[PDB]
Symmetry: C2
């Protein structure tokens, strides 16, 4: 294949671009390498850069920028919903030759490829120890050298759970309609916020125990008969039919309760799927995790809760760029 090897994930909002810079052999090459920011909008996440990679030896770069500056980009292999929309501009202005690729297959291929090459000597996978304890919480590396088989929980507006047995064998096991879209949708209705970033920032600061009814609220403490700790949620939003309780809540509390309800639910479903499929590595991905680490930490707590500590929620360092990586890999085909 011929040089400038790119891969693109054009979403209706954010655009992800990955570029493999050949080491030790063209004005475009200098522009990318000599700049950390592009067009006063684009950003190049240097910390995600993969060095000494062999595809020839080179480095893999990760760049991102709003789908708005896509017109500027044109003036200066792809997947994503925004691929179609701009297919026109890609031809009218510059040269099209745009090969549309499936979002899911690109995600899987990219995810598996990055995990296989590692993160510059370190694992691509990680988890959280003591997720809900601000003072003890810690992101920890987890070597996932053989990801087969694994369960992939892809959280977008809704949630799809896939069982991955090989590069080309992944099937949807199940899913849930209570996902990121449910979180934002409810947050908009309950707090008047408008964006994901706003809702997540709110959730990170709130206290859901003001809106949710806890087990200890019913039994004064743990309910040993059911092996339920007093801190467990008995009923999500279960205190909200009481005017007195509503008088003590804040919008942040509502956002938090919404997020907690969704993450705890996903954890329960993912854990039962792991049990039924006999798989013990559950990896979580999706835009539902890209703005605030609060979501991952809550998913970490949920997986540990429902599994009784047997299963950890696993995450990937390059989440968000897998579709783009998958697109790039198609060039070699």
């Amino acid at each position: 294949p011929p040089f400038p090897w790119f891969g693109m994930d054009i979403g209706g909002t954010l655009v992800k671009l990955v570029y493999f810079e050949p080491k030790d052999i063209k004005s475009i090459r200098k522009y990318l390498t000599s700049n950390t920011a592009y067009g006063k909008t684009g950003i190049r996440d240097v910390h995600l850069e993969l060095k000494n990679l062999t595809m020839r030896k080179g480095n893999l770069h990760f760049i991102r920028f709003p789908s708005c500056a896509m017109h500027r980009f044109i003036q200066m292999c792809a997947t994503g919903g925004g691929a179609f929309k701009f297919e026109e501009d890609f031809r009218m202005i510059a040269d099209l030759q745009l090969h549309k690729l499936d979002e899911l297959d690109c995600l899987i291929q990219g995810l598996l490829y990055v995990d296989s090459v590692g993160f510059n000597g370190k694992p691509e996978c990680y988890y959280f120890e003591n997720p809900t304890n601000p003072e003890l919480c810690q992101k920890k590396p987890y070597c996932l050298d053989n990801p087969y088989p694994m369960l992939l929980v892809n959280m977008g507006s809704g949630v799809s759970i896939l069982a991955v047995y090989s590069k080309d064998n992944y099937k949807r096991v199940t899913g849930t309609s209570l996902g990121g879209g449910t979180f934002l949708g409810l947050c908009c209705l309950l707090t008047g916020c408008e964006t994901f970033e706003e809702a997540l920032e709110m959730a990170a600061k709130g206290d859901s125990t003001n809106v949710d009814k806890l087990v200890k609220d019913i039994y004064g403490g743990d309910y040993e008969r059911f092996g339920l700790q007093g801190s467990a949620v008995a009923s999500s939003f279960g205190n909200m039919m009481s005017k007195e309780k509503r008088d003590s809540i804040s919008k942040e509390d509502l956002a938090r309760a919404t997020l907690v309800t969704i993450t705890n639910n996903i954890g329960s479903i993912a854990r039962m799927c792991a049990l039924n499929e006999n798989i013990d590595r559950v990896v979580f991905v999706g835009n539902f995790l890209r703005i605030n680490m609060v979501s991952m930490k809550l998913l970490a707590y949920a997986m540990d809760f429902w599994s009784k500590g047997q299963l950890k929620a696993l995450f990937l360092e390059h989440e968000g760029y897998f579709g783009a990586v998958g697109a790039l890999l198609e060039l070699f085909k």
Copy 2:
């Protein structure tokens, strides 16, 4: 020396009375009418006849908890509102044990020649929706989905052996709680009435909204919900919803989720008979049919949601059975 059981639960009260056939004052006022005081009913259709317990008839009566003092003045119980009126009286029994014992008993004796259990066919299609009886001969093992403020799922292996396998915090309390915040309603009854008239498809994002129809690759029909409340981050979409739609979307979200959880539990526990009970099924049949649809959906038509004719009185019956101990 009068046979009766009581379930004093916060608001509503359930009373079961075994009228002997062949303290006689009670044998009068009860048989004399079907209504008692301002709010008090006697579900005649649920009455079990020619029952051997001597032989007589088991009656089912219901009335508000506020009319409890009335009941007392005119003169074994369970429910979270028993020790209140404990002064005005009382042997309080465990809610869960009474529910199970009463449920198993009623199913064992049957409903006057007919099965106590039943399921639905084409539950969401009012033109084909038909109630079908189910013979739950030997109930062991079976899964019991008990829906209260939250949801508990129990595996029943025998009359004396059962355990909680799991549960979900998204239950009746979630439905009412969210409805109060989203619509300003105040009671479960009001919420359910609104939900029955709403359309959740204006609130939720459906699979067809994303793929223009079915999505074969995932075996997902276009009518399936892709994202609950998924259209609500759009100002233009929020402009099209009503309070009834919000209440319905809340109910559909909760019932669909419960169905999924119950289905996966059945799979993991290798138990195919799943029975649903709980005050969450208190008023009409909207929730029951939504749960029926959910079970069929998630199980791809392999499992049906099972319901019981005397749901709501099992706790009272369980209380009654304690007398013979």
